[PDB]
Structure formats: structure tokens, C-alpha cells
Structure 1
Amino acid sequence: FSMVSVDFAVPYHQQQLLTRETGELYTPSYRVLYYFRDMETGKELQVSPWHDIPLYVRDLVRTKPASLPMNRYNFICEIPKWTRAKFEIATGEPFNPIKQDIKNGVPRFYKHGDMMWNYGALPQTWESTDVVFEGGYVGDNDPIDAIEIGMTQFKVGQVGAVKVLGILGMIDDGQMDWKVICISHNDPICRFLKDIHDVPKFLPGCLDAIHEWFRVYKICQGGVENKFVFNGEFKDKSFAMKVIDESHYMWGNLRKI
């Protein structure tokens, strides 16, 4: 038996993402915490869903065609499909757990209707205010926002691999607020969706509905319609993956500080 092998020692231990809840759901004390459980040792450590969860999903040895491009990102669901309690990552609290946003002293919920798709953020991203985006707007100092459009509803704070399909430039309170469009790698049609122009072929009405909702959800809370760069048009996954890297880079610098 030839044993000639490239002694490529697998370093680190794989980690298992865990979440825990504390506080009373729908009240201001609710929090979803994240932890890593070493898969060899069993040791747990609290981690930050934002800084510590890989933006890029990778395994040790990639067996897919070197010619096939990569498109597997992690996605942190904040507002599950068919719900309206506005939850968010507490970028201010240690270990950035998920908390429900407070509008007054009262926990916030959308007045317009429900979030009809899983809504959240991509970890290890930062849309900086010191950067200027299309139409000359600056970032809103928050992780990049994502909308995963498959049939299955994620639990609050649930994380999973998605395939980026496109992006929408929404202006929010004077700043750039990209909404990345993506789909769970486990959804039945994930494979038939190659780029943003396929969303209407397989989920007719989905993109119009996403556009319309973000365009007007504030109006009924008193506000005004919202503005979009590119004409409320959805840019494709190439443009979207670029914005995400600019984003990952920006996150990298915030951490070097």
C-alpha cells in the first residue's frame, strides 16, 4: 500500500455555533446570545454573531470544480419571515447579541404589516459612514442588510448559508442602506436561481413586493416614501458580491483600530 500522502495537518478544531435566550421575549430584556462549542474539547466560549461568524462559508478541502465560482455566505436572521417585531444585532453591547429594538421605551414592531422574507445581516461586514456610495451617499455605520427569499422561515437569530443573488440601494435617513438579496442554500429552488434576473422567472412578484415594502413601510409611521439609487433597480450578484467585499474590508479596518 502506497502511503505517500501530503501531510497537511488539519489545525484548529471545528466549532459549533450555539445560541441561548435570556430575558422576556417582546420586552426590553430579551437577548439572543451566541457561543462556540469546540467539537473536540467540548469547551464553550461566548462569541459575537457579528465579528466571529465567518462571512464566507468554507470547508477545509473544496471538492467543487475549481472553475465553479464561490457564492456561500452566512446570514444572520434578525426578523423572521411573517413577523413584525423589529429585532437587531446590538452593535453596542459586548458580544453583539440580538435584542429587540426600542422605538420609545417601547419595543418596536412594524406598523405597515409583516416582514415577508427572512430579514437580517451578513456577519463581518460594515457599511461605513466615512465611505461614499452611489449617488454620493455615505454608509449608515451598520453591518450590511440582507433579505433571504426562500420558502422556509428562520428562527430569530438563526444563521445559515445563502447564495447572494443581487442587491438594492435603499436610501435611509440620508444614508446608503444596501439590502442584499439572497436565498438559503437549502431551499428547493436555490439551484435554479443563478442571478437577480431569475427571481422573477421563479418567484414572480417577489422583487416588486420587496421593492414596494421597503419603499413605503415608513409612510404609515408618519414618514415619507423612501428613495433608491439606480432607480429602485436590483443590481446583479456580481455588483452585490463587490459591495459585500468593500464591506468586509471596511469591517476589517474597524477592527484594526
Structure 2
Amino acid sequence: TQPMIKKIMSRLFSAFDVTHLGYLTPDKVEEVCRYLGRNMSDGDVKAMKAEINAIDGHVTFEKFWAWWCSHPVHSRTKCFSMVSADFSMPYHQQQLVVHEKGEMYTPSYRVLYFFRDLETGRERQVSPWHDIPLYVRDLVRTKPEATPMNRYNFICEIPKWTRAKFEIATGESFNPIKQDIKNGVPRFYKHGDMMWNYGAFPQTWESTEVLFEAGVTGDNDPVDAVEIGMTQFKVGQVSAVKVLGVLGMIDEGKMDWKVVCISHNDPICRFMKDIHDVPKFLPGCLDAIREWFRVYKICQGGEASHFAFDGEFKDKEYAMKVIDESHNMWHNLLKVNKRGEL
């Protein structure tokens, strides 16, 4: 009798009121009985059609539900096994829900994430880091099996044209987004605005236990992403992106890959197929990204950033390896060592 069962029965009802009259015609009443009764004889069935006929007026869904719930929970469940097979969903869709706890630009501000199970309606808090899938996987993959997958979830921490340095709080339960703290106050970029959507990939971690080719360990954070599309995102907004390449930034002695990606919703996504297409269609974009990350902390007392491969942006095949490997590291962190907070 739970809300999940009610939705199943609601879809069942629609198969007998396809045109949404709002009620069951007499013919439809006999038909839903012939259907529910399929794993019965007439003993429990005779009692069923007689019961529904004795309802007063139009058999609305609401009255049909009432009739259904009035039966004994055991006998219901026998025929319900058929109903459930035909009318339950393949999987329960989870709606990502975002809530703010004010006040923005002060240390108290948080962006919290929840799941709303669309079948049960139950809400639970989740971690944008651990619980948002890194890979966007269709239940039924219709794109041809030849073309390989390139659809990643990107969590936007810092929208295009802004400079409040929001971050997934790796140290707090459920890892809400917060504003980073620098010199005791909420941190704003001093160098200038972030000129692309900036954020991170969920279910990745720049491991402090891994010696990257560059001779350093990781910066202890989710893998960083720069989304170069034309649309400004909201803080905490999550959207599907295509990975194009990656910059081997070494930041304060830690590996700090910067993945270049573009929203699958951008008008030029189709035409950007690897890192080399970015100079062709967005000349100066890669140079500006490399330079911004090279110098941005200098005005803050830091030093110029170093880069592996002499600052070369590696291609997408390489970037997806980097992401895959940080997914493994994240598996080791959360699944194996049970660390949900740093």
C-alpha cells in the first residue's frame, strides 16, 4: 500500500483509461478484472468484479485505489506479482535536488545535494562527490556500439565570469559545496574572474598516495575540469560534458590535472572532437586557460604553476585515461578504505 505501489497502480489504471477520461467505463471495468484475475479462477475473481461493480458512480482512480487497498494484503500480492512485472519501472529514477543554506559569500553558506526517488518520493541527502555518477550511462545504449562513450557529469563550482571560489567540501559529511577560506575570509580570486565554468568530476580523487609521472602526488581533491562552452552555469549545477583534453598543471608541488571539456548542450559540441579542434574553433582559448592557471596565485603570494609535458594539452584519449585512473583511486578511497570525508 506504499506510494510506490500507488504509482504502479496509477500506470495500470491509465492502461485502461488511455485517453484520460478520469474513470473506468463499464467495458474497462470488466477488462481490468479479466486482467487482475489472470492468475486467479473465479473464487477470488467473482468477489473482485462484484466488489468493483458495487462502487458508487464513476470508478475514478482514487476509488479504484480505495478498492485495491481494502483487500487483504496477502491475496493482493499474488496477482500483484503480475502487475508489478508489467507496470513497475525498470529502475527508480533519482532526481538530483539542490538546497542552499545561506548566507552566500559568508562562511556559513552551503550547497546541499539530495536524491528524490521519483517512485517512492523519499528524499535523502547525498554527496555530490560520491553519489553523482562520473559516467553518464544510458540504461539502453542506443548510440552504435562502435562509437565510444564520452559523456561525463561535471559539477560546476565556479560559474563562468565569476570569482567566488566555491569548492566541494571534501572534509564535511555529504560533501556540500562551500566557499573556500583564504587568510581567514571567504576566498575570491584576486587575479581576475574565472572565464569558463570551473568545477570537478564526481567519483575521482587526486590521490595523495600516488606518484604521478611528474614526480609528485595529487592535490587531494576531485579532478578539476574547465568547461569551455558559451553558457554560464549556476553554482552547483551538474551537466553532461564531453572531454577534449587535459593540462598537466602541477600546483604547489601536487599533481593538479585540468581537464578541458565542453557541454553536450553547446551549439559547437558536435564539431569539437579532440583537443586540436579547440584552437581551430576557439583560438586563444587553450593559451588563456594555461596562462590564467600559470599565474593566478602569484598576486596572492604564491608562485607560478609548473606544467608536465612543457604545458602541452594532451588529447582526449589521454584525458580519459587520467579520469579513469582517478576513478580507481576514488574507488580505493571510498569503497576500500571507507573514507567519505578527508
TM, length-normalised to structure 2 = 0.72
CA deviation profile, 1:138-174 (whole Å, cap 9, x unmatched): 1111110000100001100100000000000111111
User: What does residue 154 of structure 1 align with?
Assistant: 233
- Whole-angstrom CA distance in 1 between matches of 2:309 and 2:139: 39
Find 2:165's aligned residue among 81, 86, 91. 86
- Whole-angstrom CA distance in 2 between matches of 1:226 and 1:136: 15
Which amino acid letter does the alignment assign opposite residue 291 of structure 2? Answer: E
Offset at residue 94 of structure 1 (A): 0.6
Which amino acid letter does the alignment assign opposite residue 40 of structure 1? Answer: E
Root-mean-square deviation over aligned CA pairs:
1.3
User: What does residue 224 of structure 2 align with?
Assistant: 145
Which amino acid letter does the alignment assign opposite residue 107 of structure 2? Answer: P
- Whole-angstrom CA distance in 1 between matches of 2:306 and 2:238: 29
Q: Helix, strand or coil: the match of 1:137?
A: coil
Offset at residue 93 of structure 1 (A): 0.6
User: What does residue 203 of structure 1 align with?
Assistant: 282
Q: Helix, strand or coil: the match of 2:230?
A: coil
Which amino acid letter does the alignment assign opposite residue 174 of structure 2? Answer: F
User: What does residue 99 of structure 2 align with?
Assistant: 20
Greater per-residue strand proportion? 1
User: What does residue 35 of structure 1 align with?
Assistant: 114
TM, length-normalised to structure 1 = 0.95
**Number of aligned pairs?**
251
Deviates more, 1:12-21 or 1:220-229: 220-229
Higher relative contact order (CA 8 A, sep 6+): 1
Structure 1 residue 48 and structure 2 residue 115: aligned? Answer: no
Q: Helix, strand or coil: the match of 1:138?
A: coil
- Whole-angstrom CA distance in 2 between matches of 1:185 and 1:11: 26
Offset at residue 127 of structure 1 (A): 1.0
How do 1:93-104 residues align onto structure 2 when only pairs under 5 Å count?
Answer: 93-104=172-183
Larger radius of gyration: 2
Structure 1 residue 130 and structure 2 residue 209: aligned? Answer: yes
Offset at residue 44 of structure 1 (A): 0.9
- Whole-angstrom CA distance in 2 between matches of 1:126 and 1:93: 15
Offset at residue 23 of structure 1 (A): 2.0
- Whole-angstrom CA distance in 1 between matches of 2:174 and 2:91: 22
- Whole-angstrom CA distance in 2 between matches of 1:251 and 1:214: 25
- Whole-angstrom CA distance in 2 between matches of 1:10 and 1:131: 42
What are the ranges of 5 or more consecutive residues in structure 1 without an aligned counterpart? 1-6
Offset at residue 11 of structure 1 (A): 4.3
- Whole-angstrom CA distance in 2 between matches of 1:48 and 1:12: 21
Q: Helix, strand or coil: the match of 2:112?
A: strand
User: What does residue 67 of structure 1 align with?
Assistant: 146
- Whole-angstrom CA distance in 2 between matches of 1:22 and 1:248: 30
User: What does residue 214 of structure 1 align with?
Assistant: 293
Offset at residue 25 of structure 1 (A): 0.3
- Whole-angstrom CA distance in 1 between matches of 2:91 and 2:120: 11
Q: Helix, strand or coil: the match of 2:288?
A: helix
What are the ranges of 5 or more consecutive residues in structure 2 without an aligned counterpart? 1-84, 338-342
Deviates more, 1:113-122 or 1:11-20: 11-20
User: What does residue 4 of structure 1 align with?
Assistant: none
- Whole-angstrom CA distance in 2 between matches of 1:223 and 1:122: 25
Deviates more, 1:216-225 or 1:230-239: 216-225
User: What does residue 250 of structure 1 align with?
Assistant: 329
Which amino acid letter does the alignment assign opposite residue 222 of structure 2? Answer: P
- Whole-angstrom CA distance in 1 between matches of 2:113 and 2:263: 21
